[PDB]
Ligand binder design. Structure first.
Ligand SMILES: Nc1ncnc2c1ncn2[C@@H]1O[C@@H]2COP(=O)(O)O[C@H]2[C@H]1O
Ligand SMILES: Nc1ncnc2c1ncn2[C@@H]1O[C@@H]2COP(=O)(O)O[C@H]2[C@H]1O
Ligand SMILES: Nc1ncnc2c1ncn2[C@@H]1O[C@@H]2COP(=O)(O)O[C@H]2[C@H]1O
Ligand SMILES: [Hg+2]
Ligand SMILES: [Hg+2]
Ligand SMILES: [Hg+2]
Lengths: 531, 531, 531
């Protein structure tokens, strides 16, 4: 009852209300501000106002369709459907006139003033009251009591379009909804938009044909108008309307005239005006179609543009053909036909979303790799936030022996081969890491690592490595243990790292459980290398 | 009198003058340079020249409309309006010829040379004097005294279009004004531009129809021209002009011919030429309409493109559906359907504008938060310039206990919950800050902070924090006091911070008023937490 | 046999399979997962499914072409080609109906579920089974046994288009292939795309003309239809079809009607509908043509835009004309009409590709320059990765004497002149370097270096220089030796560097072979300067 009424009048919490007023607490405060009126008032964001604008829109469309047909072909309409439609439109327009008093205006620059007592009424009386009044003047059944004549009277109903001109915030909300829909579905959105355009053009053709038959009627059908020429002055209204609409549509779409070219001044000038209007609207239609298509094929176009820029670079530097093919298939394997700026996206997001994304991306790595499978989640999240994606092609040398290292790698996909001066070549696969002994000893690379298949790795710089491990030293002890074991395995040895770990162990800092965990890690690594 | 004359001739201070000559002092110097002439001279930026170009434009439009109609349908015109229009156009063209002497040219590469005595006269005598002279030759009433004939004479008046070709700087100023208008109003600008295009095309149709009726007239209406075919050789000039314009417009908009297809060579070739011209101009019209629409829907298109790139990223990484929905609603709540680069904007602005903007943005924070409500404005502006906006979703963990902290947060909207190992959970709301104890003690986070509703915060890094507080130490004392109180409240204690503050207090650096203010701050914080 | 069958059903390793499933090991795992069915099943990426979709596409095109002609002009077809085509289409549609059971669906969000036993059958029974069944219902030869009539029956065959609506993954693969082709060949791609569009429009014209002749046939040719008006009710089917297609095509391309304008209600409304459809499709065609052209001229447009921005900058700063010409010819010589972001490209690539590219770019430098011609490849690759391209114009001063230096240069093309206070001017050419004595002594520049012709150099910063040389000191000794020799040559001397090298030599760190190599380097440099 009154509770539902007040709820309808008060701005309901919705996505549009949140977008316009920030927090939900502000929505509650605005509900309270509406409550401060005491006298009934509808908020420009009320669901009641939304539904009312909806029914007013459907009534305006019905009127736009029906008014010209009546004016032209129906002199007097006293049948049931005509009377009920006229009275329905009259009462609806009057109710809208009334309710436009208690409507809170919404000015720009974040200006929304209820101003129930006087400001809204005064602004409406000064702005648009007279046109809505003459619209709401009832059907000619009341004008005959107050005072071709009928055809002259009904003209006053053409200005009901101004209500549709005012009804635009609902149009903007519908445009937002349709934009969401278009981003969701591609082809359906195109179909809907082109059908909307076709509907607009068809309504214009309707009005044009109505006018083209109306004007020869206001002159009692002179002997040289197209009606008297085609001798269809006595045909039923169906044929007359059909042929008039045909003439109007042929003038719009630039097909031709009707039977023949005009011969009288009246229909001559009407034909010229209709030709101008139709040509302009068809140009607008072509423009909208071009815009729709160009918006449809955006991503493919951007991909082609990036590809062309890469081609221009390779051409400017005059690279060999095989190298160009290598660059192209590398791009194909890295981006897989897609285009985006991952750095910009990750910068736009926030910390919890980035953590969620990297955890989902490296779920399998966290599951398989032992250190992550047993470490504290804060350290895991730090490492995963510091990682960075990379792709390597078969035969490429990921690490060259002797050089200075500045990053380590975590394998996500593929197989990598480790080659030394000895014949012992060891092949790592998913869930294993390499290139950390250089980062742990500050020396040079101790072995060469070459990609055997297409490898997909996650590299970690040396600065981030040192930062994270300075924040967590026990993981550094674990890394050093695994690295010493690997070095002992290949047949080389780093006395610096060995003596450092031996001193740390003799210092008694580690516990029995600690060295047990370290033995578990080294066993797991031995298994992962043997497999 | 002479004062107003000199003021009109001298470049008036306006937005265009400022844009062209930098400082207002340069405008005064150019006024002086004009004064150095001694002989009267109009500056190419004078309001007098502006008004003169305006009236010359309206006269050129009147001539473009009237000349062909006269030439074609009016053999001799001795009535009052015709005579007055001819003499008006003649005197106006002659006055423009005269005033083009004392006009200072404006070359490119910042070249504006008054050069009153000789250079302007010589350049005009060498450039365009003869065509303007033959234009300014008076109406045929003087040519008959000097020496179909009339129709041959009036041709000399067609070259008045060259004056309109010269009048282009006023066109550029009008284009600037219309660009401002178009940036201001959207739909009105589109209506104005399409009406301008339609007017151009209609003027072309006018000239085309005039020619199409003129040529059969110069041949005494042969029996096979369209005029003699339609037997309208004797009709009043109204009907002839109407039907000729109809033929021209049907040829342009590609509807058809007139009554029937041409049958004679003359009108055959004229029809082909008119068809070519009309098709070209309609193609140009379609192009302009497409450009206008595509410029109308720019921002929506850019928003759609960014959304599509985010979608492509999420697809390349194969994220779950709920995570994709979370990303999308986060974007919706962060940007609210708008698109801009805040970093680039703030980099484009300057320091006072940035200070103004951040002060307006954080007005409520400065009002509510006690430290800012009592501190020195320089410190307040430093902090507000260092802040950075952020958005969090409900349930997200803003701060996880035990981790290392690198920023603090100031709440602008929403509610945040503080959870510890104890059951004491404390809820902060607008105007409160958290996450500073880690920055003050260089330890770890002492509690977990989780967003309860959609939170909108302003984060401050640790480097900027330390910089600002090294510039202002008393605020650091206040922060430390509030932090010690909060720690004591939750039930934990940091002996390092406690002993540091105790030593600073025993050092006698603080005053009675100082500790009074600190007690006020701690009381206000207790109230803000209790509420 | 069965081996080839299982191979066809299992997803073959291809570029699309790799793009959809990452590593080849995943492709093998999916082959195994298909093997887990036990009951035969085709994978949505099987080459068998590809070939089947191909033959179904050709059958659908044949049906789209043949069905309307039959329905309209061929009452009963009992000849050999008609019967064989009908039975072929029937069996093909039935086989597709059958095979759509064992087809694994492919949902979005990385969802590919074989689900052989029940899920696929249930989903197909709930989704699209009935329409495919009524399609697969055989030709009317079976419907007559089961129960104008013929023309009523064959309508059931129009819904075979739904199969073409389903066949879209093959369309996407063909679109990928055509995108590769379009990136490869420019003009051929445009020709193919416009021919595709023309084919679509022609098929639509075909259906439209078929309908336009069909409707007057279903009414026994009333006396006022266009057929009875043109008296072609008795002509052979060739002429009737030709004239109907002519009417439809004239309605689409907006030429006109047929003989004359319609006179009856039926063909009146059919003409209006056909006009609407044709205008819409021609608008779509114009849109696609505009998009194709705009995609064709992309790179030229981007180059023009960058040029215009440079022009706007130079205009805003009001630079002289000769300076503007200098800027423009510098741009012409630096980028050579091409446009790309080398930094972004090199950031997108990886380390081995970057090493390959820089090695190919500086091959001649490595060949000619002695230090690189004798040094270790790791040092060479470090230097080449640190270098950076630069271009200088004739007369420009590359290095001014006395100033502080922050980079050295390696000449790739051109000649440079070295000027001192003495008259000894020495000219360096390709393969020589300069500007290292400042970097080695931390003093000031010891001579001026001016470009004589258009120079193309590779500059190396001072930080990278010091980093690389701290990683490799012997090369620093070589640089110092060459620099001391050059200084002694010009007539100046740096006692600091001289004494440092003398102390290093007296320290006995160098070997006989080492100083032999150094003598070789200094001899080679003397030769390169003398030449
Ligand atoms: N036995 C081994 N098994 C697996 N990986 C190894 C082995 N020995 C060395 N590596 C890795 O190969 C890398 C080569 O360079 P680094 O010495 O920087 O670090 C080395 C380790 O990451
Ligand atoms: N009693 C409290 N009331 C409000 N906020 C608190 C309280 N105790 C701790 N906090 C905040 O919670 C944060 C958790 O991490 P920090 O220790 O970095 O800094 C802490 C303070 O900002
Ligand atoms: N005799 C020479 N031959 C070639 N180049 C020289 C000679 N003397 C000096 N240079 C170069 O000219 C440079 C001028 O500045 P720098 O002293 O930094 O380093 C100097 C050398 O690179
Ligand atoms: Hg109305
Ligand atoms: Hg003139
Ligand atoms: Hg079929």
């Amino acid at each position: 009852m009154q509770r539902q009424f007040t709820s309808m009048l008060q701005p309901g919490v919705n996505k549009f209300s949140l977008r316009m007023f920030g927090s939900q607490k502000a929505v509650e405060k605005e509900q309270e501000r509406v409550k401060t009126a005491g006298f009934w008032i509808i908020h420009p964001y009320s669901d009641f106002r939304f539904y009312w604008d909806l029914i007013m829109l459907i009534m305006m469309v019905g009127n736009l369709v029906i008014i010209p047909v009546g004016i032209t072909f129906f002199t007097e309409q006293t049948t049931t459907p005509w009377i009920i439609f006229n009275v329905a439109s009259d009462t609806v327009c009057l109710l809208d006139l009334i309710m436009n008093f208690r409507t809170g205006t919404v000015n720009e620059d974040s200006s929304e003033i209820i101003l129930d007592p006087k400001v809204i009424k005064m602004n409406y009386l000064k702005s648009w009251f007279v046109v809505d009044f003459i619209s709401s003047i009832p059907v000619d059944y009341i004008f005959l009591i107050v005072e071709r004549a009928l055809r002259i009277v009904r003209f006053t109903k053409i200005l009901c379009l101004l209500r549709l001109l005012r009804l635009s915030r609902l149009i903007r909300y519908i445009h937002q909804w349709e934009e969401i829909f278009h981003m969701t579905y591609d082809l359906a959105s195109a179909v809907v938009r082109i059908f909307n355009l076709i509907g607009m053009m068809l309504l214009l053709c309707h009005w044009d044909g109505c006018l083209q038959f109306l004007v020869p009627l206001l002159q009692d059908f002179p002997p040289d108008c197209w009606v008297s020429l085609n001798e269809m002055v006595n045909d039923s209204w169906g044929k007359q309307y059909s042929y008039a609409l045909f003439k109007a549509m042929s003038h719009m779409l630039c097909i031709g005239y009707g039977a023949q070219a005009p011969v009288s001044m009246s229909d001559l000038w009407i034909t010229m005006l209709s030709m101008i209007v139709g040509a302009t609207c068809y140009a607008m239609f072509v423009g909208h179609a071009t815009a729709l298509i160009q918006s449809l094929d955006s991503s493919r176009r951007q991909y082609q543009e990036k590809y062309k820029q890469v081609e221009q670079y390779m051409s400017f530097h005059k690279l060999p053909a095989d190298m160009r093919q290598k660059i192209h298939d590398y791009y194909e394997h890295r981006y897989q036909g897609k285009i985006f700026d991952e750095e910009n996206i990750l910068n736009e997001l926030n910390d919890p979303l980035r953590e969620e994304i990297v955890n989902f991306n490296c779920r399998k790595l966290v599951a398989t790799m032992p250190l992550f499978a047993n470490a504290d989640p804060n350290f895991v999240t730090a490492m995963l936030s510091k990682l960075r994606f990379e792709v390597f092609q078969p035969g490429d040398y990921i690490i060259r022996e002797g050089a200075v290292g500045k990053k380590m790698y975590f394998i996500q996909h593929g197989v990598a081969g480790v080659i030394t001066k000895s014949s012992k070549e060891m092949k790592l696969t998913d869930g294993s890491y390499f290139g950390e002994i250089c980062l742990l000893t500050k020396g040079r690379r101790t072995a060469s690592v070459r990609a055997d298949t297409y490898c997909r790795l996650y590299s970690l710089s040396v600065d981030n490595f040192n930062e994270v491990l300075e924040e967590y030293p026990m993981m550094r002890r674990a890394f050093e243990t695994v690295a010493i074991d690997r070095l002992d395995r290949i047949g080389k040895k780093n006395s610096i790292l060995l003596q450092k770990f031996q001193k740390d162990l003799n210092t008694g800092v580690f516990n029995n459980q600690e060295n047990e965990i370290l033995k578990q890690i080294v066993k797991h690594d031995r298994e992962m290398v043997q497999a």
